[PDB]
Nucleic acid binder design. Structure first.
Lengths: 124, 125, 170, 187, 106
RNA sequence: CUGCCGAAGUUUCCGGAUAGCAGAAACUCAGAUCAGUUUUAUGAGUAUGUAAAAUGAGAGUUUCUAGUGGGCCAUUUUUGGUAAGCAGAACUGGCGAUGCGGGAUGAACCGAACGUGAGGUUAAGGUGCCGGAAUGUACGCUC
RNA sequence: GCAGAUCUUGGUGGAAGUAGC
RNA sequence: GCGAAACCACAGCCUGGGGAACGGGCCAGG
RNA sequence: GAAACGGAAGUGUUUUAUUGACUUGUCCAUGAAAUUCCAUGUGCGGAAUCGAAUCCAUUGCAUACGACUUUA
């Protein structure tokens, strides 16, 4: 069950490129006369449930693992039985001291870390 | 003029399943259809359109509406076979068919002989 | 470490059986054949025997310099040139293990892997040349008897202007 | 069937629309097309027919009279000239009156799908582009209709020299026994 | 130099398209010498390539190739439908393609 | 933000009570019923109606509870017409809440009604070029 | 939970170094 | 030298057609 | 090294004189491989230079200004 994405482009809000005051976060058009709501030809696509991805491969990174947010060594040890299904992702606000402790622990557990090189240097 | 649509004139079929088969006109159904027949068993007597045949220069005397067997007798009597073949038109067609049948080894041989032929290059000074 | 630690999604029993490859009727042993790809593209070589899928093929090494090789039957054109006598030469020594690339053993130390002080080369052994010479000796009289065939195998096939492969016959 | 880098077409006896459509499709196919003798193109219809068609065109734009400019206009209308693909295809077409020196020594082909003798019913009036151009503004008809004989005379002399030269090898062909010793291959 | 070219010349005409909708995933290829849909049956499944050159000498070479295969004939005149590993660029309309003889069934 | 359901756009009296359309709840009910359907024959006047056959679907409800109370394109039947067009009724459906292929382009014409994709095959239209597809076959008219 | 309210407050543009003094 | 304000959805060459203006914005052309 | 021909946009058609080679014309002897089944001078930025043009002595011949024409 390799990972298949029905779509890789994001859904940008209509007229978000024309106007800087209009953000690109998707907003469902409400105008009846608007051609985007009527889904004419050549217009931008809209989020539909048909675009949803496979339940088995949902939330899975391109390497087949699911990102599990980790904030300390207690969170890494949780993935002892799920190292083939989940990858550890250290939070952004975890200091470089705790990041080191997390990374050594994850290495013994056989757990992939998504951002294991952040905020640290190497010295062999 | 040398080719007139006539009773008894030999034609060559160029379209249809009988392409490349000689035949002789036996009757004129209309200006667009002619009744032809050939002595060989592979060519049944049939009505063909004038756009599917080319007209040859051989005219052999037949009675109007002659039957298939009598057409063969006249064809053998007037030796149309080996008379059409004598013309360079049939020799060119036969050579084209033979050349199409050559395989890869035969094509290599032809290149060797034609190189042996070309190296002749003897011209008087 | 042995008891499975996960769900162990064991594959279902797949009902697929291995059956012998049905090669073309024109790829008989001994027929002259044109190589289509590889470093020896365009060469004409003699089919010694058929392996399971590939054809154990070689041109006489004294003719076109194509050694005992394997060729996939899809990347070859079986010409209609007169067949060569190949029943004489035994071909039982040509199996997939005979042509298989040497497995990686790599006996080294972590002192010469650094500095690249290994220089590992596996140039073709003498028995391979001996086998090639034996095949050449048993094949050359067969190609010498029939005319215009020795240098035909030396030539390289190519397409010229106006050549239509869908119409040309080989 | 097959393509060349440059294809030279002798437009003598070719219908304007039939040749232009074939040329336009070849231009879009990625080929460089040269059309010579553009003044010898034919158009179905009598002299007065296309006369009023061109006279109405004059009533309408940059009115061009030269026969090549007529043919160039016909080909252009059959191209997507509003896009870069159509413009690029147009630049590969070289239409001229007569056969200039770079092209009179090159082989010229014809388009059977555009030939008048194979498309127009016998006994149908036709208007040559060169003659039609001569009265609507073109003024170089006489000088190009005079130079063609010079080209024809030189070309005819070349053909005679080539034919005389060929006779030697032709005689030498049957002279060599190997020509018929292995002529069983059809050659 | 006529001892090479094991392939057959071809031209990239367009993508599969209606009057106003184009489908770049499948391309229309005109194999030269093939003049009908019955002769297009010989080239079905054959490998076709687009060969071009780019400025960078990446891989220590100046030439790069897009591979593809011939799927089915298109129309009556011998054009074929080819699917390439990467969709052929629209700039290659009228460009040249090479149709090999492998996978060969001859 | 996504998903699901989904109108009416008008009878009747007369701003509404309605009804009707669309949902919720409380039911019972296949050994039973229902139907923009066709029938059998005779009743009445080919149509029309009848009780009981074919086909399809399980159906009947009771209560309350949102929204609407127009038009347009017109077709057809049709009345008056009146220089002639045209106007007046009903009927019929569609648009109105509907994107898509075609129609050179197109709000009402021909096809077809929509989750995200791969492959195949078509409809209406088409296959000289623009433009994907026979400068196809056969028989005729016209310059 | 904002794109609209000839929205409120603030900031900043093209007009324009123009009309002009 | 000093120095505005009104105004500002956005670009901006024409001939025809797009039925509800179609036009500037579509279609076919120059 | 060449001479002729080629004007329509000749820019190429020959004639060669030789000087060297491959000569597939043909017959032999060597070498091909573990790629052991497809993947394939030119441009810029600087200078020392040589000419030319403009401004320039200019001029009204031109003239809102540009820009133009003559002469140092």
């Amino acid at each position: 069950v390799n990972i298949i994405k029905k779509r890789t482009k994001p859904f940008k809000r209509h007229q978000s490129d024309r106007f800087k005051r209009v953000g690109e976060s998707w907003r469902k058009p409400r105008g009846i006369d608007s051609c985007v709501r009527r889904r004419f030809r050549g217009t931008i696509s809209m989020p539909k449930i048909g675009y949803g991805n496979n339940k088995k491969t949902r939330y899975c990174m391109p390497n087949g693992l699911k990102a599990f947010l980790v904030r300390n060594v207690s969170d890494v040890e949780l993935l002892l039985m799920h190292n083939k299904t989940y990858a550890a992702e250290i939070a952004g606000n975890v200091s470089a001291r705790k990041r080191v402790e997390i990374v050594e622990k994850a290495r013994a557990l056989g757990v992939k870390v998504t951002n294991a090189g952040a905020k640290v240097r190497s010295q062999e | 003029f040398k080719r007139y649509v006539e009773v008894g004139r030999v034609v060559l079929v160029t379209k249809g399943e009988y392409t490349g088969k000689l035949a002789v006109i036996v009757d004129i159904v209309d200006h667009k259809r002619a009744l032809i027949d050939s002595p060989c068993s592979e060519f049944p007597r049939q009505v063909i359109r004038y756009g599917s045949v080319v007209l040859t220069h051989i005219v052999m005397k037949l009675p109007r509406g002659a039957r298939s067997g009598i057409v063969a007798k006249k064809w053998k009597a007037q030796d149309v076979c080996n008379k059409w073949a004598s013309s360079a038109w049939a020799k060119k067609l036969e050579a084209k068919k033979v050349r199409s049948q050559l395989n890869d080894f035969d094509r290599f041989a032809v290149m060797r002989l034609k190189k042996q032929r070309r190296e002749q290059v003897n011209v008087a000074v | 470490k042995y008891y499975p630690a996960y769900r162990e999604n064991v594959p279902k029993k797949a009902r697929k059986a291995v059956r012998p490859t049905k090669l073309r009727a024109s790829l008989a042993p001994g027929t002259v054949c044109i190589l289509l790809a590889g470093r020896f593209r365009g060469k004409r070589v003699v089919v010694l025997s058929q392996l399971e899928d590939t054809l154990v093929v070689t041109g006489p090494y004294k003719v076109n310099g194509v050694p005992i090789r394997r060729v996939n039957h899809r990347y070859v054109i079986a010409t209609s040139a007169p067949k060569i006598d190949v029943s004489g030469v035994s071909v039982e020594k040509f199996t997939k293990a005979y042509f298989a690339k040497q497995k990686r053993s790599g006996p080294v130390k972590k002192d010469e892997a650094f500095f690249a002080e290994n220089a590992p080369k596996n140039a073709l052994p003498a028995e391979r040349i001996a086998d090639q010479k034996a095949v050449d000796a048993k094949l050359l009289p067969a190609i010498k008897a029939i005319p215009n065939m020795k240098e035909y195998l030396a030539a390289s096939f190519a397409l010229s202007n106006g050549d239509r492969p869908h119409l040309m016959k080989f | 069937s097959e393509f060349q880098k440059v294809v030279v077409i002798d437009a003598k006896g070719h219908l304007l629309g039939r040749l232009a459509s074939v040329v336009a499709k070849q231009l879009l196919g990625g080929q460089k097309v040269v059309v010579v003798r553009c003044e010898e193109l034919n158009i179905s219809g009598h002299f007065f027919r296309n006369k009023l068609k061109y006279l109405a065109y004059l009533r309408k734009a940059f009115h061009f009279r030269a026969p090549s400019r007529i043919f160039q206009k016909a080909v252009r209308g059959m191209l997507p000239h509003k896009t870069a693909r159509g413009q690029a295809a147009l630049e590969h077409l070289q239409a001229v009156e007569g056969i200039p020196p770079p092209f009179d020594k090159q082989k010229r082909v014809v388009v059977p799908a555009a030939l008048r003798v194979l498309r127009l019913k016998p006994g149908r009036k036709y208007c040559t582009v060169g003659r039609l151009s001569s009265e609507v503004g073109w003024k170089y008809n006489d000088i190009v209709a005079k130079l063609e004989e010079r080209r024809k005379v030189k070309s005819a002399a070349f053909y005679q020299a080539k034919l005389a030269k060929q006779k030697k090898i032709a005689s030498a062909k049957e002279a060599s026994p190997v020509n018929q010793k292995l002529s069983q291959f059809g050659y | 130099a006529q001892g090479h070219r094991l392939y057959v010349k071809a031209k990239h005409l367009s993508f599969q398209r209606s009057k106003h909708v184009i489908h770049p995933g499948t391309s229309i290829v005109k194999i030269e010498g093939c003049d009908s849909k019955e002769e297009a049956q010989f080239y079905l499944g054959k490998r076709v390539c687009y060969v071009y050159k780019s400025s960078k000498a990446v891989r220590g070479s100046k030439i790069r190739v897009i591979w593809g295969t011939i799927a089915r004939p298109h129309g009556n005149s011998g054009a074929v439908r080819a699917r390439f590993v990467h969709n052929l660029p629209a700039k290659t309309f009228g460009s040249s393609l090479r149709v090999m003889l492998y996978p060969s069934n001859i």
